[PDB]
Design a protein around this ligand. Structure first.
Ligand SMILES: [Mn+2]
Ligand SMILES: [Mn+2]
Ligand SMILES: [Mn+2]
Ligand SMILES: [Mn+2]
Lengths: 198, 198, 198, 198
């Protein structure tokens, strides 16, 4: 009942920033596996929930969280990126980024440190904190969802697992961070932003 | 659909080892709350599973694990204890405890260190490892189930949370450990033991 | 070498809100055991350091964070309480509380909710975020120290480990929280706010 | 001060099983960065120690366990691999493997399953349990060192972080595992077994 979403562009669309080969492996291989493992795990859960088996239920948690998170995370990732993307946002979003981080440049600097800060697998996030309406920068381990574990609403996420860049950038996570700013689809981030204050 | 099990004895049955007041609070107040919170959490999960909401699903995990675990753990605890209990086991179980820990006395010494070892809330367990048929001593945090998180089959569990003893023994966890050995219902542990090798 | 700080008042000074039996036991047993094991773990860590033992250094971490955090946590705690009033804070801090949590009463209940939501052993805090420049509430497991694990400088803490209230309020953590506002030393909390000077 | 150990063989010595581009990058970039940050974190920890700073000591833990574990983990790793054969081990170790995992091939696959089941970054191990007196398999997250976090003395380790196989095997972790048995230095693994002398 969960399906692999189609990329809103081609594998070679985010070039030269994101290599077309990484884009296919990432979408067709990695993301494909999460959706698949989520469906069996979710299905298995209904059988455990159905019998009242609390042991099977609790046992299936790491799998549900990891595959569930991977599906959530990557669905949002593709939409945050675009061949038509780049630069900086406008209107509401741009006024808020300024107001909260100092300037647009200070925001990037903070989202980059949070993304490189991750030790092991993980993600960097620009989210929205509902209690006291403000933007926030958070880092998540492995495939842990941003909203599912912190409550923040995901606006812009930066996959910082080694599979998201190693083929092209190798061990230099900072260079991957630098390049990626060019493909950020802000009208996507903006759309996500307007739906939070309402 | 989950209900609070009835104690196989009275609140004042495990005296003087376990105070009758602790027994009532523990059963009627603490255990009562887990069963109750588990039912709403499980019920809430079916609604999230029903809509395919992975975020609600992952969000409800800490609650399901804690209340689920608390119900599992305490159900097993009451049965491990008895007013007719005490001493040491016999037959199969006694030969295995000897074989695996050195002697019965070395086993107690190890289960005690594992129970006092817990820093914060937790449990001490004598379990059974299916892969390579042997008894094992494990410690679990908060209300994390033994089988649900480690795979071991629970035989004898020792609640080491402060609510399981503070009124009677105060901060002296070691004295509570010493006293409890007198109320262990081994025929219960034995029954649990025979069902593992078959 | 680390030392146990004498209570800033008498054991039974916080009654009827916090019993003398509780304070006595909490300070001279629990806290007393934290500073000792902290000193031992610290002694053991400097020998592992002189030696190139990275294995021994990592093995000590859990004892160091628990006991080291236990002493940090409990030290501030005593200074957060006082025989002399609870009520409301004045000046700068009170304003900040309103600027961030809407009002004092709304702050009051968001911290109560955080303290009550702690599953297992832990603490509830009011801290100061120096990188955002505002106040914020947080929860910490077992004795994990606020500043060393979150960067948030602690102003007011509330121990929700069962040994902090059980002898008096039993399982009713919500009643222990109502009564502790009557003894919160807001003079201390205000000094701690103007410590990360504004 | 800690130092980078030279590979016991040439960068391209493990081909076609493990490429030279991978080994080069893995040793001179990743490992090289671990020993440095380990030395810095260690320098910073002795100043926090001289001072009575328990807050700073706890803040350093994550950098110390990751980098300190990274160096421990990667050091043993190089000595687990060799241009000279994989195949089967002889004598005592081989017997023990059979006594505990049934057979060599059955051990082979239980460690593969452990290495493949790692969600995110981590390692798969074959260790020796000194308190039970037998061999056992384990999995460790990120760079958490086996002995410092489990007490199990490491004999054979398998890095399953994506930077260990991606450039060559891509997403197919199961293929990287098949090929690594061809380069396992069983002479080293046997010395490590007779190190915790039997
Ligand atoms: Mn990814
Ligand atoms: Mn209990
Ligand atoms: Mn306490
Ligand atoms: Mn590695």
């Amino acid at each position: 009942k969960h399906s692999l979403p189609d990329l809103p562009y081609d594998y070679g669309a985010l070039e030269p920033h994101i290599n077309a080969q990484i884009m296919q492996l990432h979408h067709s291989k990695h993301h494909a596996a999460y959706v698949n493992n989520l469906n069996v795990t979710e299905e298995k859960y209904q059988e455990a929930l159905a019998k009242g088996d609390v042991t099977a239920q609790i046992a299936l948690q790491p799998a549900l969280k990891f595959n569930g998170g991977g599906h959530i995370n990557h669905s949002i990732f593709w939409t945050n990126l675009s061949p038509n993307g780049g630069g900086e946002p406008k209107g509401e979003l741009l006024e808020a980024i300024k107001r909260d981080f100092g300037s647009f440049d200070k925001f990037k600097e903070k989202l980059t440190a949070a993304s490189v800060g991750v030790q092991g697998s993980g993600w960097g996030w620009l989210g929205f904190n509902k209690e006291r309406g403000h933007l926030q920068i958070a880092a998540c381990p492995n495939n842990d969802p941003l909203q599912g574990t912190t409550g923040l609403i995901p606006l812009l996420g930066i996959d910082v697992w080694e599979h998201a860049y190693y083929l092209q950038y190798k061990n230099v996570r900072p260079d991957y961070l630098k390049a990626i700013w060019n493909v950020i689809n802000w009208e996507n981030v903006t759309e996500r932003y307007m739906a939070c204050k309402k």
